Amino acid sequence: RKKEFIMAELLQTEKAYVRDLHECLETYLWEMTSGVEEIPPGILNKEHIIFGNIQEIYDFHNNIFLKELEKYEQLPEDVGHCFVTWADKFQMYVTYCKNKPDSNQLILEHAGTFFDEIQQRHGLANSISSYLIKPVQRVTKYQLLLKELLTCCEEGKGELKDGLEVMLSVPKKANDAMH
Amino acid sequence: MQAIKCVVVGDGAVGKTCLLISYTTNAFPGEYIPTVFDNYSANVMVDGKPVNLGLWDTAGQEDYDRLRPLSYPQTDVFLICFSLVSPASFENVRAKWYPEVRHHCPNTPIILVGTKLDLRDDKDTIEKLKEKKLTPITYPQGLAMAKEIGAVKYLECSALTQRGLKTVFDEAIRAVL
Numbered sequence: 256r257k258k259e260f261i262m263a264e265l266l267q268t269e270k271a272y273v274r275d276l277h278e279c280l281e282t283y284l285w286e287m288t289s290g291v292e293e294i295p296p297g298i299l300n301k302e303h304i305i306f307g308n309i310q311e312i313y314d315f316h317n318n319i320f321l322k323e324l325e326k327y328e329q330l331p332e333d334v335g336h337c338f339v340t341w342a343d344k345f346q347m348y349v350t351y352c353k354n355k356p357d358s359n360q361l362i363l364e365h366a367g368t369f370f371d372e373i374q375q376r377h378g379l380a381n382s383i384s385s386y387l388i389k390p391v392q393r394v395t396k397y398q399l400l401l402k403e404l405l406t407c408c409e410e411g412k413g414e415l416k417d418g419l420e421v422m423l424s425v426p427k428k429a430n431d432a433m434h
Numbered sequence: 435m436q437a438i439k440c441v442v443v444g445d446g447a448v449g450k451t452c453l454l455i456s457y458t459t460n461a462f463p464g465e466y467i468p469t470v471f472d473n474y475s476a477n478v479m480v481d482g483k484p485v486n487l488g489l490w491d492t493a494g495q496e497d498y499d500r501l502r503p504l505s506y507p508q509t510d511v512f513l514i515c516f517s518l519v520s521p522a523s524f525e526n527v528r529a530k531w532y533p534e535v536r537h538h539c540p541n542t543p544i545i546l547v548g549t550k551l552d553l554r555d556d557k558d559t560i561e562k563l564k565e566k567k568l569t570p571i572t573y574p575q576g577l578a579m580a581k582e583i584g585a586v587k588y589l590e591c592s593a594l595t596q597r598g599l600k601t602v603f604d605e606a607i608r609a610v611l
Protein backbone atom coordinates (compact mmCIF):
# COMPACT_ATOMS: atom_id res chain seq x y z
CA ARG A 256 0.00 0.00 0.00
CA LYS A 257 2.77 2.44 0.88
CA LYS A 258 4.68 1.95 -2.36
CA GLU A 259 1.45 2.70 -4.27
CA PHE A 260 1.08 5.96 -2.30
CA ILE A 261 4.67 6.94 -3.10
CA MET A 262 4.28 6.19 -6.83
CA ALA A 263 1.00 8.14 -6.91
CA GLU A 264 2.70 11.17 -5.34
CA LEU A 265 5.60 10.94 -7.78
CA LEU A 266 3.20 11.06 -10.74
CA GLN A 267 0.86 13.72 -9.36
CA THR A 268 3.68 16.08 -8.39
CA GLU A 269 5.32 15.46 -11.79
CA LYS A 270 2.12 16.60 -13.52
CA ALA A 271 1.97 19.67 -11.24
CA TYR A 272 5.61 20.45 -12.07
CA VAL A 273 4.99 20.31 -15.85
CA ARG A 274 1.89 22.52 -15.41
CA ASP A 275 3.84 25.08 -13.35
CA LEU A 276 6.71 25.36 -15.82
CA HIS A 277 4.18 25.66 -18.66
CA GLU A 278 2.44 28.55 -16.83
CA CYS A 279 5.76 30.34 -16.19
CA LEU A 280 6.72 30.09 -19.90
CA GLU A 281 3.37 31.29 -21.21
CA THR A 282 3.02 34.23 -18.83
CA TYR A 283 6.20 35.75 -17.41
CA LEU A 284 8.31 34.73 -20.43
CA TRP A 285 5.71 35.34 -23.17
CA GLU A 286 5.34 38.93 -21.91
CA MET A 287 9.00 39.71 -22.51
CA THR A 288 9.20 38.15 -25.95
CA SER A 289 5.70 38.78 -27.31
CA GLY A 290 6.46 42.37 -28.20
CA VAL A 291 3.10 43.33 -26.73
CA GLU A 292 4.20 45.52 -23.79
CA GLU A 293 6.95 47.75 -22.37
CA ILE A 294 10.13 46.17 -20.99
CA PRO A 295 12.73 48.03 -18.89
CA PRO A 296 16.00 48.62 -20.77
CA GLY A 297 17.81 46.99 -17.85
CA ILE A 298 16.36 43.59 -18.78
CA LEU A 299 15.43 44.10 -22.45
CA ASN A 300 16.74 41.16 -24.54
CA LYS A 301 18.13 39.46 -21.41
CA GLU A 302 15.50 36.72 -21.09
CA HIS A 303 18.13 33.97 -21.39
CA ILE A 304 19.77 35.20 -18.17
CA ILE A 305 16.47 35.54 -16.32
CA PHE A 306 14.98 32.16 -17.30
CA GLY A 307 18.16 30.17 -17.94
CA ASN A 308 17.47 26.91 -19.76
CA ILE A 309 14.05 26.37 -18.20
CA GLN A 310 12.57 26.00 -21.72
CA GLU A 311 14.83 22.98 -22.33
CA ILE A 312 14.01 21.54 -18.91
CA TYR A 313 10.27 21.89 -19.58
CA ASP A 314 10.61 20.24 -23.01
CA PHE A 315 12.31 17.23 -21.41
CA HIS A 316 9.63 16.65 -18.75
CA ASN A 317 6.69 17.52 -21.05
CA ASN A 318 7.90 15.51 -24.09
CA ILE A 319 9.64 12.55 -22.42
CA PHE A 320 9.94 12.10 -18.64
CA LEU A 321 6.29 12.40 -17.48
CA LYS A 322 5.27 9.95 -20.23
CA GLU A 323 7.96 7.47 -19.21
CA LEU A 324 7.17 7.73 -15.46
CA GLU A 325 3.52 6.97 -16.35
CA LYS A 326 4.65 3.69 -17.97
CA TYR A 327 6.10 2.70 -14.56
CA GLU A 328 2.84 3.32 -12.64
CA GLN A 329 2.17 -0.38 -11.98
CA LEU A 330 5.89 -1.12 -11.57
CA PRO A 331 6.91 1.12 -8.66
CA GLU A 332 9.75 -1.24 -7.56
CA ASP A 333 11.36 -0.73 -10.98
CA VAL A 334 11.06 3.07 -11.33
CA GLY A 335 14.70 3.63 -10.36
CA HIS A 336 15.50 2.50 -13.92
CA CYS A 337 13.65 5.50 -15.42
CA PHE A 338 16.28 7.76 -13.85
CA VAL A 339 19.16 5.59 -15.06
CA THR A 340 17.82 5.64 -18.64
CA TRP A 341 17.46 9.42 -18.86
CA ALA A 342 20.46 10.30 -16.65
CA ASP A 343 22.14 12.44 -19.35
CA LYS A 344 19.11 14.73 -19.64
CA PHE A 345 19.32 15.71 -15.95
CA GLN A 346 22.65 17.39 -16.64
CA MET A 347 20.57 20.42 -17.71
CA TYR A 348 19.89 21.09 -14.03
CA VAL A 349 23.60 21.80 -13.48
CA THR A 350 23.41 24.59 -16.07
CA TYR A 351 20.19 25.88 -14.50
CA CYS A 352 21.48 26.07 -10.92
CA LYS A 353 24.75 27.72 -11.95
CA ASN A 354 22.84 30.57 -13.58
CA LYS A 355 20.23 31.08 -10.81
CA PRO A 356 22.13 33.73 -8.78
CA ASP A 357 22.69 35.88 -11.91
CA SER A 358 18.97 35.55 -12.65
CA ASN A 359 17.92 36.68 -9.19
CA GLN A 360 20.48 39.50 -9.19
CA LEU A 361 19.36 40.80 -12.59
CA ILE A 362 15.67 40.74 -11.63
CA LEU A 363 16.35 42.55 -8.35
CA GLU A 364 18.55 45.27 -9.87
CA HIS A 365 16.88 46.09 -13.19
CA ALA A 366 13.42 44.49 -13.35
CA GLY A 367 11.59 46.96 -11.11
CA THR A 368 7.92 46.02 -10.80
CA PHE A 369 7.69 44.62 -14.35
CA PHE A 370 7.20 40.97 -13.35
CA ASP A 371 5.14 41.90 -10.30
CA GLU A 372 2.82 43.87 -12.61
CA ILE A 373 2.63 40.83 -14.91
CA GLN A 374 1.64 38.64 -11.94
CA GLN A 375 -1.21 40.96 -10.95
CA ARG A 376 -2.66 41.13 -14.45
CA HIS A 377 -2.77 37.32 -14.74
CA GLY A 378 -3.93 36.76 -11.16
CA LEU A 379 -1.12 34.29 -10.44
CA ALA A 380 -0.64 33.20 -6.84
CA ASN A 381 3.01 32.41 -7.61
CA SER A 382 5.57 35.15 -8.28
CA ILE A 383 8.26 34.74 -10.93
CA SER A 384 10.71 34.01 -8.09
CA SER A 385 8.36 31.30 -6.84
CA TYR A 386 8.34 29.65 -10.28
CA LEU A 387 12.07 29.97 -10.96
CA ILE A 388 13.01 28.14 -7.70
CA LYS A 389 10.99 25.07 -8.70
CA PRO A 390 13.62 23.29 -10.79
CA VAL A 391 15.99 23.60 -7.81
CA GLN A 392 13.33 22.07 -5.57
CA ARG A 393 12.39 19.33 -8.04
CA VAL A 394 15.92 18.05 -8.70
CA THR A 395 16.48 17.63 -4.92
CA LYS A 396 13.09 15.94 -4.34
CA TYR A 397 13.46 12.83 -6.51
CA GLN A 398 16.05 11.29 -4.15
CA LEU A 399 13.61 11.60 -1.21
CA LEU A 400 10.93 9.66 -3.08
CA LEU A 401 13.40 6.93 -4.13
CA LYS A 402 14.58 6.60 -0.48
CA GLU A 403 10.94 6.21 0.57
CA LEU A 404 10.47 3.36 -1.93
CA LEU A 405 13.54 1.61 -0.49
CA THR A 406 11.79 1.39 2.91
CA CYS A 407 8.90 -0.67 1.50
CA CYS A 408 10.14 -2.60 -1.56
CA GLU A 409 11.48 -6.14 -1.13
CA GLU A 410 11.98 -6.75 -4.83
CA GLY A 411 13.67 -5.15 -6.43
CA LYS A 412 15.91 -2.98 -4.27
CA GLY A 413 18.66 -3.21 -6.90
CA GLU A 414 16.78 -1.13 -9.48
CA LEU A 415 15.96 1.55 -6.90
CA LYS A 416 19.56 1.76 -5.61
CA ASP A 417 21.03 2.51 -9.05
CA GLY A 418 18.37 5.18 -9.66
CA LEU A 419 18.97 6.75 -6.25
CA GLU A 420 22.74 6.87 -6.97
CA VAL A 421 21.99 8.86 -10.11
CA MET A 422 19.65 11.28 -8.32
CA LEU A 423 22.20 11.93 -5.57
CA SER A 424 25.00 12.59 -8.10
CA VAL A 425 23.04 15.13 -10.16
CA PRO A 426 22.23 17.59 -7.36
CA LYS A 427 25.71 17.03 -5.90
CA LYS A 428 27.30 17.97 -9.24
CA ALA A 429 24.98 20.99 -9.50
CA ASN A 430 25.93 22.00 -5.94
CA ASP A 431 29.64 21.66 -6.64
CA ALA A 432 29.30 23.85 -9.75
CA MET A 433 28.11 26.88 -7.73
CA HIS A 434 30.70 29.67 -7.28
CA MET B 435 -2.17 43.84 0.50
CA GLN B 436 0.98 43.09 2.51
CA ALA B 437 2.77 40.01 1.12
CA ILE B 438 5.02 37.85 3.30
CA LYS B 439 7.59 35.25 2.26
CA CYS B 440 8.30 32.69 5.01
CA VAL B 441 10.93 29.98 4.55
CA VAL B 442 11.13 26.87 6.77
CA VAL B 443 14.61 25.39 7.45
CA GLY B 444 16.14 22.70 9.69
CA ASP B 445 17.49 19.10 9.73
CA GLY B 446 15.87 16.24 7.85
CA ALA B 447 12.97 14.60 9.65
CA VAL B 448 12.48 17.34 12.25
CA GLY B 449 9.07 17.45 10.55
CA LYS B 450 9.24 20.49 8.25
CA THR B 451 6.88 19.04 5.63
CA CYS B 452 4.46 17.72 8.29
CA LEU B 453 4.39 21.06 10.05
CA LEU B 454 3.42 22.81 6.80
CA ILE B 455 0.80 20.22 5.72
CA SER B 456 -0.79 20.06 9.17
CA TYR B 457 -1.10 23.85 9.28
CA THR B 458 -2.45 24.43 5.77
CA THR B 459 -4.90 21.49 5.78
CA ASN B 460 -5.81 21.66 9.47
CA ALA B 461 -5.04 17.96 10.04
CA PHE B 462 -2.06 15.65 10.54
CA PRO B 463 -1.71 13.48 7.37
CA GLY B 464 -1.60 10.11 9.28
CA GLU B 465 -2.60 7.81 6.40
CA TYR B 466 0.48 8.77 4.37
CA ILE B 467 3.04 11.48 4.98
CA PRO B 468 3.68 13.30 1.70
CA THR B 469 7.26 14.07 0.65
CA VAL B 470 6.35 17.15 -1.40
CA PHE B 471 4.92 20.51 -0.21
CA ASP B 472 4.71 22.92 -3.19
CA ASN B 473 5.15 26.68 -2.55
CA TYR B 474 1.94 27.91 -0.90
CA SER B 475 0.02 31.24 -0.67
CA ALA B 476 -3.08 32.22 1.30
CA ASN B 477 -4.88 35.26 2.68
CA VAL B 478 -4.96 35.24 6.47
CA MET B 479 -6.30 37.63 9.11
CA VAL B 480 -4.09 38.62 12.04
CA ASP B 481 -5.13 41.32 14.54
CA GLY B 482 -7.61 42.94 12.15
CA LYS B 483 -4.92 43.09 9.48
CA PRO B 484 -5.28 41.30 6.11
CA VAL B 485 -2.08 39.67 4.85
CA ASN B 486 -0.93 37.27 2.14
CA LEU B 487 1.29 34.58 3.71
CA GLY B 488 3.64 32.64 1.43
CA LEU B 489 5.27 29.41 2.66
CA TRP B 490 8.28 27.61 1.14
CA ASP B 491 9.52 24.16 2.25
CA THR B 492 13.21 23.13 1.98
CA ALA B 493 13.03 19.32 2.56
CA GLY B 494 15.50 17.46 0.35
CA GLN B 495 18.06 20.25 0.23
CA GLU B 496 19.71 19.51 3.62
CA ASP B 497 22.87 18.04 2.06
CA TYR B 498 23.51 20.73 -0.59
CA ASP B 499 25.01 23.80 1.08
CA ARG B 500 25.30 25.86 -2.12
CA LEU B 501 21.80 25.07 -3.43
CA ARG B 502 19.99 25.91 -0.17
CA PRO B 503 20.73 29.64 -0.19
CA LEU B 504 19.03 30.02 -3.59
CA SER B 505 15.74 30.15 -1.63
CA TYR B 506 16.89 32.80 0.87
CA PRO B 507 16.93 36.19 -0.98
CA GLN B 508 13.94 38.50 -0.20
CA THR B 509 12.71 36.28 2.67
CA ASP B 510 10.71 38.31 5.22
CA VAL B 511 10.83 35.79 8.12
CA PHE B 512 12.51 32.43 8.82
CA LEU B 513 11.31 29.50 10.92
CA ILE B 514 14.41 27.62 12.09
CA CYS B 515 13.15 24.21 13.33
CA PHE B 516 14.51 21.37 15.47
CA SER B 517 12.82 18.30 16.99
CA LEU B 518 12.39 18.39 20.80
CA VAL B 519 13.38 14.73 20.92
CA SER B 520 16.52 15.06 18.74
CA PRO B 521 19.39 16.81 20.56
CA ALA B 522 21.51 16.56 17.39
CA SER B 523 18.94 18.62 15.41
CA PHE B 524 19.00 21.17 18.29
CA GLU B 525 22.78 21.59 18.23
CA ASN B 526 22.62 22.00 14.44
CA VAL B 527 20.59 25.20 15.01
CA ARG B 528 23.86 26.69 16.26
CA ALA B 529 26.31 24.77 14.04
CA LYS B 530 24.53 24.92 10.68
CA TRP B 531 21.24 26.85 10.31
CA TYR B 532 21.69 30.19 12.13
CA PRO B 533 25.11 30.91 10.58
CA GLU B 534 24.01 30.47 6.96
CA VAL B 535 20.64 32.18 7.35
CA ARG B 536 22.18 35.23 9.03
CA HIS B 537 25.06 35.36 6.55
CA HIS B 538 22.71 35.58 3.55
CA CYS B 539 19.96 37.57 5.27
CA PRO B 540 21.62 39.91 7.83
CA ASN B 541 18.46 41.83 8.81
CA THR B 542 15.76 39.15 8.61
CA PRO B 543 13.89 38.05 11.76
CA ILE B 544 14.15 34.47 12.99
CA ILE B 545 11.62 32.43 14.95
CA LEU B 546 13.05 29.34 16.68
CA VAL B 547 10.55 26.42 16.58
CA GLY B 548 10.70 23.21 18.62
CA THR B 549 8.69 20.45 16.87
CA LYS B 550 7.17 17.07 17.92
CA LEU B 551 6.09 18.42 21.33
CA ASP B 552 3.80 15.39 21.76
CA LEU B 553 6.83 13.08 22.04
CA ARG B 554 8.66 14.85 24.90
CA ASP B 555 6.71 12.91 27.55
CA ASP B 556 6.46 9.68 25.52
CA LYS B 557 7.81 6.70 27.50
CA ASP B 558 9.37 4.77 24.60
CA THR B 559 10.95 7.89 23.10
CA ILE B 560 12.53 8.82 26.43
CA GLU B 561 13.85 5.28 26.91
CA LYS B 562 15.43 5.18 23.45
CA LEU B 563 17.17 8.52 24.14
CA LYS B 564 18.28 7.14 27.53
CA GLU B 565 20.00 4.19 25.82
CA LYS B 566 22.15 6.80 24.07
CA LYS B 567 22.84 8.84 27.22
CA LEU B 568 20.54 11.65 26.04
CA THR B 569 17.33 13.35 27.20
CA PRO B 570 14.73 15.52 25.45
CA ILE B 571 15.25 19.27 24.92
CA THR B 572 13.34 21.24 27.58
CA TYR B 573 11.90 24.78 27.54
CA PRO B 574 14.83 26.63 29.16
CA GLN B 575 17.25 25.08 26.62
CA GLY B 576 15.03 26.45 23.85
CA LEU B 577 14.98 29.91 25.46
CA ALA B 578 18.76 29.94 25.84
CA MET B 579 19.34 28.88 22.22
CA ALA B 580 16.96 31.58 20.97
CA LYS B 581 18.86 34.22 22.94
CA GLU B 582 22.16 32.99 21.54
CA ILE B 583 21.07 33.27 17.90
CA GLY B 584 19.01 36.45 18.41
CA ALA B 585 15.65 34.86 17.57
CA VAL B 586 12.69 37.21 18.17
CA LYS B 587 10.62 34.31 19.64
CA TYR B 588 10.98 30.70 20.81
CA LEU B 589 7.87 28.50 20.23
CA GLU B 590 7.03 24.79 20.74
CA CYS B 591 4.41 22.82 18.74
CA SER B 592 3.09 19.47 17.52
CA ALA B 593 1.97 18.80 13.94
CA LEU B 594 0.31 15.63 15.26
CA THR B 595 -1.97 17.16 17.93
CA GLN B 596 -1.84 20.73 16.47
CA ARG B 597 -0.99 22.10 19.93
CA GLY B 598 0.79 25.44 19.44
CA LEU B 599 0.69 25.08 15.64
CA LYS B 600 -1.43 28.11 14.60
CA THR B 601 0.52 30.29 17.05
CA VAL B 602 3.81 29.64 15.24
CA PHE B 603 2.50 31.09 11.98
CA ASP B 604 0.64 33.96 13.66
CA GLU B 605 3.87 35.06 15.34
CA ALA B 606 5.83 34.73 12.08
CA ILE B 607 3.44 37.30 10.59
CA ARG B 608 3.71 39.51 13.70
CA ALA B 609 7.50 39.53 13.37
CA VAL B 610 7.07 41.30 10.03
CA LEU B 611 4.15 43.69 10.61
Ligand SMILES: Nc1nc2c(ncn2[C@@H]2O[C@H](COP(=O)(O)OP(=O)(O)O)[C@@H](O)[C@H]2O)c(=O)[nH]1
Pocket residue numbers: 444445446447448449450451452453467493549550551552553591592593594595
Ligand atom coordinates in the same frame (compact mmCIF):
# COMPACT_ATOMS: atom_id res chain seq x y z
N1 LIG C 1 4.84 12.33 16.92
C1 LIG C 1 5.02 13.27 15.96
N2 LIG C 1 5.66 12.90 14.82
C2 LIG C 1 5.87 13.79 13.82
C3 LIG C 1 5.42 15.17 13.99
N3 LIG C 1 5.76 15.82 12.86
C4 LIG C 1 6.39 14.95 12.03
N4 LIG C 1 6.46 13.74 12.62
C5 LIG C 1 7.08 12.54 12.05
O1 LIG C 1 8.45 12.85 11.78
C6 LIG C 1 8.83 12.32 10.51
C7 LIG C 1 9.44 13.42 9.65
O2 LIG C 1 8.44 14.36 9.23
P1 LIG C 1 8.66 15.27 7.89
O3 LIG C 1 7.58 16.31 7.85
O4 LIG C 1 8.79 14.35 6.70
O5 LIG C 1 10.12 15.93 8.19
P2 LIG C 1 11.07 16.77 7.16
O6 LIG C 1 12.05 15.79 6.59
O7 LIG C 1 11.81 17.80 8.02
O8 LIG C 1 10.09 17.32 6.14
C8 LIG C 1 7.58 11.72 9.87
O9 LIG C 1 7.65 10.29 9.99
C9 LIG C 1 6.43 12.21 10.72
O10 LIG C 1 5.48 11.19 10.98
C10 LIG C 1 4.73 15.50 15.26
O11 LIG C 1 4.30 16.65 15.48
N5 LIG C 1 4.58 14.53 16.16
